[PDB]
Every structure is written in C-alpha cells, then in structure tokens.
Amino acid sequence: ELLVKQGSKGTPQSLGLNLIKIQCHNEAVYQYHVTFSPSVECKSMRFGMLKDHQSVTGNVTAFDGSILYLPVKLQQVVELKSQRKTDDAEISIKIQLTKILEPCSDLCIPFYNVVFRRVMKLLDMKLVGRNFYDPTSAMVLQQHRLQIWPGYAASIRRTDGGLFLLADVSHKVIRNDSVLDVMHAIYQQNKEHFQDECSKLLVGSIVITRYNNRTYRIDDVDWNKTPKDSFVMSDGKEITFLEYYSKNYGITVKEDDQPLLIHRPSERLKGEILLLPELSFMTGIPEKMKKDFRAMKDLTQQINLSPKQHHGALECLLQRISQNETASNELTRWGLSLHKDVHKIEGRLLPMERINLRNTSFVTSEDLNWVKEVTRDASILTIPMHFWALFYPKRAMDQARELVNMLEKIAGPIGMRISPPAWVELKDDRIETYIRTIQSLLGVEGKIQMVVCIIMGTRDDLYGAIKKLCCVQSPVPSQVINVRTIGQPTRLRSVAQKILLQMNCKLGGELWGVDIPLKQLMVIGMDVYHDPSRGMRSVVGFVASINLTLTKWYSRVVFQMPHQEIVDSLKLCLVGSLKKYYEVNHCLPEKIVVYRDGVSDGQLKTVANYEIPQLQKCFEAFDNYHPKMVVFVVQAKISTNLYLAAPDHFVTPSPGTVVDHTITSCEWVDFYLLAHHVRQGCGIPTHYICVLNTANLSPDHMQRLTFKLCHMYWNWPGTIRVPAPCKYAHKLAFLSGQILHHEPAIQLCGNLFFL
RNA sequence: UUACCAUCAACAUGGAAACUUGGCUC
RNA sequence: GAGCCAAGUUUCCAUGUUGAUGGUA
Ligand SMILES: [Mg+2]
Secondary structure (H helix, E strand, O other): OOOOOOOOOOEEEEEEEOEEEEEEOOOOEEEEEOOOOOOOOOOOHHHHHHHHOOOOOOOOOOOOOOEEEEOOOOOOOEEEEEEOOOOOOEEEEEEOOOEEEOOOOOOOHHHHHHHHHHHHHOOOOEEEOOEEEOOOOOEEEOOOOEEEEEEEEEEEEEEOOEEEEEEEEEEEEEEOOEHHHHHHHHHHHOOOOHHHHHHHHHOOOEEEEOOOOEEEEOOEEEOOOOOOOEEEEOOOEEEEHHHHHHHHOOOOOOOOOOOEEEEOOOOOOOOOEEEOOOOEEEOOOOHHHHOOHHHHHHHHHHHOOOHHHHHHHHHHHHHHHHHOHHHHHHHHHOOEEEOOOOOEEEEEEOOOOEEEOOOOEEEOOOOOEOOOOOOOOOOOEOOOEOOEEEEEOOOOHHHHHHHHHHHHHHHHHHOOOEOOOEEEEOOOOOHHHHHHHHHHHHHHOOOOOEEEEEEOOOOHHHHHHHHHHHHHHOOOOEEEEEOOOOOOOOOHHHHHHHHHHHHHHOOOOEOOEOOOOOOOEEEEEEEEEOOOOOOOOEEEEEEEEOOOOOOOEEEEEEEEOOOOOHHHHHHHHHHHHHHHHHHHHOOOOOEEEEEEEOOOOOOHHHHHHHHHHHHHHHHHHOOOOOOEEEEEEEEOOOOOOEOEEOOOOEEOOOOOEEEOOOOOOOOOEEEEEEOOOOOOOOEOOEEEEEEEEOOOOOHHHHHHHHHHHOOOOOOOOEOOOOOHHHHHHHHHHHHHHHHOOOOOOOOHHHOOOOO
C-alpha cells in the first residue's frame, strides 16, 4: 500500500530537511567485478588504474575498489594490462559483468552512493571514518594539538519521496598529534618509564589509519618489531611493511624505528593486524583537554550548530557542488542532477496534552515542561511515608540535614507526609559498613519503608551493591544521593522536589497522566539490553501497563544465555504481564501495544515475520485470547534533522512534530516524531516503525498515542524522546544488567523501583 | 548514582550486492 | 549448468551501547 498518512490533526509546519532531492535520468547500469590478480588494494590507486583506460571503459566510471559500474554495456569478460606507476610491475586486471541494474532500482543505491563519494572526492574533502570532511574550513586548537573539520555524513537513500541525499553536518575531531609523535613527547617527558606509560595510555586507546581510513583498538604495543620487518599478505606472500606501503598504497614511510600496534579481533579472525604509528593517529578529546573549560566550551559551541548554521553548511555544500565543474560533470554524466537547495516539506504539529493530577488538570505550555507545575500541586496518588533511614558518613551530615529540611519544606505542596528519619551515621565509608548497617537496621525492624543513602563522590560499586541488597536480597525501596547534588543551595530546592517525586514513584504512587481514548490498552515496553562484557549475556527488560488509567507498570526481567532465544523469554514475560493484568484489572485487554527498542533496518523483517508470530503464539496459552496487537520498532539515534522556517532563517522545530511522508521507508508504515523540547542544536526526531498493526490503528491515533506515551515518563516532568515504557524498560534492563546481574524481587516489581 | 536534552569519541550487532573458499546438491 | 548453507573480504548502509562534555531544572 502507498503511504498516505499526513492527516489534518496538528498544524502544518514548514520543515526544512537535511535532504537534497536527486533526480535520476540513467537508462542502464552494468555492474562488473574487477579482479586485479596480484592484489592491488588502495581504493584510489585502483581508481587511477581504472581511469588509465578511458577508451574501452569510457569516461563514466563508478568505481569503488572492487566493483565497477558502466553505462556502456561492455562485453562479457575482458582483460587489461595496466601499470601500477609505483615500483615497477605490470598489473593484470579483469572484468566480470556480474549484473545488469535497471534505472529505478534499490540495488543502484550503493552505486549512487559510490558516485556521490566520488563527487565529494572532487570537492577535495577528505574521507574520515565513513563521512567526508573539509580541512579548509577546519578550526584548530594549537594548545591541545587538535582540529575540528566541519563536514557531512552524506548518503543517497530511496524514501517515499524518492532519491534523496541525507547530509548531516557532522564534525570530525582530527588530532594533529600522531601516535608516533605522542611517543616522542612521552619519551621527552620520561626516559625509563616510557614503555609502561605508553602501555597504560595506548592499550584501550583507539587509533585511526587515514591511508585506508580504518579504526583499530590497540590491544597491545609490540616494541620488538618495526616496519622494516616482514609479514605475509593473504596470497601467502612475504613482504616488508615499507614495500607494501610503497606498492599497495604508494606511501614512502619517513621513519622506520617506530614500534608496532597489535589489534586482536574480538568475538573469535585470529589475525594480529599490525599497525604503523606514523600513519596511525588518535581520535578523541585528549586527557588534558577534558578539564579545560575554554577549549571544551569552544568545541561545544562550534559543534552545537543551530538549524540556521546546519542549513548554511548544507547550502555551502550544494554551492560547492554546483560551482565545481568536475563534480557537476561527474553527477551529470550519470544523469544524476542534484537540487540547488535542500528539500523542505510540510509536517504536522500535534496538539498539547492536558496533564492531569489529583485535583488539577493543566494544558502543557509550548516548552512542554511541567517542572514547577507539579511541585505546586498534589500527585494523583501519594503514599504516606514515615519510617525510613538516612545513611550518611558524617561528612555530608550538614548536607543530609539540608536535604531533610528542603524535603519537609517541599512535602507540603507535593502532598507527601514526611517524618524525620533514622539519622544513621556510619562508622566507616566502606561498602561493607553501608551494607551491614542497612541489613542490621532492617534485620531488627520490619516497619521501615525506605533506605536512602548518601555516597561520597562517584562510587558505582557502592550504588550497585546497595541496589543488590535492596531489590534482590532484602526487598526495600532504595534511594541513592550524591554529595554533589545536595551540596550547593542554588539547585538544592528542585533536587529535593524531584527526589521526593522519586520517593513517591518508588512506593507505588502515581504522579501524572493524561486522558487516553483507547480502552483496555495493554502497553508493552521492551529494551533488549546487550552486554559486550559478560559473554553476550543479553538482558530483556519488560514493562507492562496494569491499570486502565495507564499508571501502574509491572516489570519483568529475562536473561539470555549464549545459544538461547528471545522467544520463550518473551513468552514468560508476556504471560506474567497478562497474569498481573488479570489479577488486578479482573479482565483481559483487547489491545496489546508493544514498543520494541533497538532494531536495525535489516532485522526489521526478522522481527516482523519471526518473533511476532511467536508473540501471537503466546496468546493461545490463555482461554480464547486473541486481541489486536501493535508492534513498534523504536529507533532513537538517527541522522535526519528537522528545521523550522522562521521568516528570517531556520530555527529549532517546535516540540511534537510528526513527519509521515517523504522521509519514511518504502516497505514499512513509518513516521518521525520530535516529541521533546530541545534547546541545544538541531532537533533530531525519533523513528517509529510499525512492524504490525492488527488493530487498524490509523496514523492519527497512532502518532497521538506515541506522543501521549512520551508524556508518561515520571523520572522527568516533561516530554522525553522515546515513549515512557521504552525508557522504563531501558532503565530496568540497565539496572538488572550492569547493577543487579540478577532478577529483582517480585513484590518490588509492582512498583517503579528502578527510577 | 537528582534528572532530561544536545553533540562528540569509540565499540558492538545486523542487512543488501559482488567476489572468493569449503561442503552438499539436482 | 542451476540452486542451498557456512565462513571471509570489499563496498554501501542501519541500529544499539558505553564514556565525555556542555546546556537547564
Ligand atoms: Mg530502550
């Protein structure tokens, strides 16, 4: 079905885009596999060899290193005898004619992209990582030996509107200090302690090589080897590093006394990739620059481009493309005529939602923030909390009394009935003293409602162990404060406000909600938390709405061992969720809405045709249970940018903007929603892909329901990017994966204990 | 770990095309 | 000859995560 979703609800917004329309007038593409037999690999020297033959291959070539594209229909299988122009050896190349590609094809998308990477190469922009950056517009920090290149993450894609060039104005941190120059500086710093200092600085530090443009993690540094030595290339051939770089890449290496960097490929090839530090350069903010206020503020104020500056950089790119004769010729020879200005459309702005409290219901302002409108009125349900204990190591004791004073001053308009705690001073600041004191306080007394601790500095092990005690071993709701958030009195008041709201959340109270027209709605939020350190011990959190007014969230956690499946884990989580829903609501829901987090574009069909059929196979375990299911793939980090056409320039878009045309994928029912208010930089929306819709949910109530679920998040009094169940599931899975490493207590799963 | 939002640095996973290798295989 | 599966390389991409900076509450 064709995607016609742009309805009348919401006001039209003239949105500029980071999209430039590309009109294609190609008539035939032919794809060949060049088969250089003595194995040249440079991606530019091979381009030079393919440009050496402009007669048989013509002057129009979309070459990329191993795949050639022609419009000329060259004969099947030919051979050529090119010259390497380096150290002398004739180069025997082949031609394959693998495929015939039609004009309007999605397999021409890599060919279009290769043409445009060549076009950016014709603007003298360097290729760093996977993007193109301009060193002419670079800004330099000489005090840190670093530069920022303003360039573009650009890619041609086929959306509903057709062929588009997505160009995001990215910035590349290019460190002028080489790795070899870093070893030179450290060797100047100390002599005997040079190698171990380079070991602790470099192992874990990740470098780039710009001659092939690849990033490698330094797993070790070998000081016993030097480029001069010899290694074996994949044709089983023994050659030195210098000869390999002067032949396969055409680079003469200045210094040959440099050591070697070993990158061990994880999740296994067993090949020690061996790296030269002359062509290896670090990427990232240096250690001395991290604590610099001026340098980081200049870097941040440059990279936090407003939509006016974003569109200005895109217009500069289009002006550079149009003014350069070679780039315009290269685009025109393929029939790819670029647009002079970026694409712009008319999106919709969704209406504001009445946030409801116990007695007051207020329409949200344009800021979409209710920070001060919720600490002046009462929450919907406020559980009174009297018996609790505050744990402090006598150094934040004044800060503890200040926090208690602010809490009892603010519990009035909040609605909490707050009693003074047990002021548990700790004889030591150790984790063992903390845990034994909490356990001894709860061992004798069973009427204690809460345990609130104060942590000296940033201690992740102490917070993790406190949460290990509090929602696994002894199910007591917990709260952890730092001394940096209650020290100064300037922000102490709002900190105490949100802390008391957190106390009300972790006890089963309800903070705020909106009116929802959909009845018996069964909201599911999931976030498959992947572990890159525990041997792929994936954690799937599961947050399920329970009451009809969409305010109680029953939580579940399932762990995935190696060689397991998400199927039975989601089976157990869903049957537990419907068991809780039946035991509370005394009914069964007619509509289950699932918000799956983190699915790539390739795994979308895998999610749609494999996992969700088993999700409806869970449904037969109950008595004639067949409701209507709606599954969402949520993609938060995207590269599409929305602008707002003010009558002078481009500004940040108003929060709550939907785009359901011209950007969406062809094979799915998609839209982009910018729900949150953003004041820094450009407002990235969040991609919302309908994997399945059995409820016949039109995109009017679909977008409105996702926007409404963006409001329900109770750890922030305003709109967040993802919906509230996605963020609840993400925090639950993060706490059960990196902090708990265990399933929680079932009773504490009745409340938002992870907030 | 009082939160949310931006952008940067990196890692990990997955898809499509082409090619190569090794098994089957009609 | 055609087809299936596994692994790898090169192109194009997509998604998540961890840090680090800022902002404001
Ligand atoms: Mg999530």
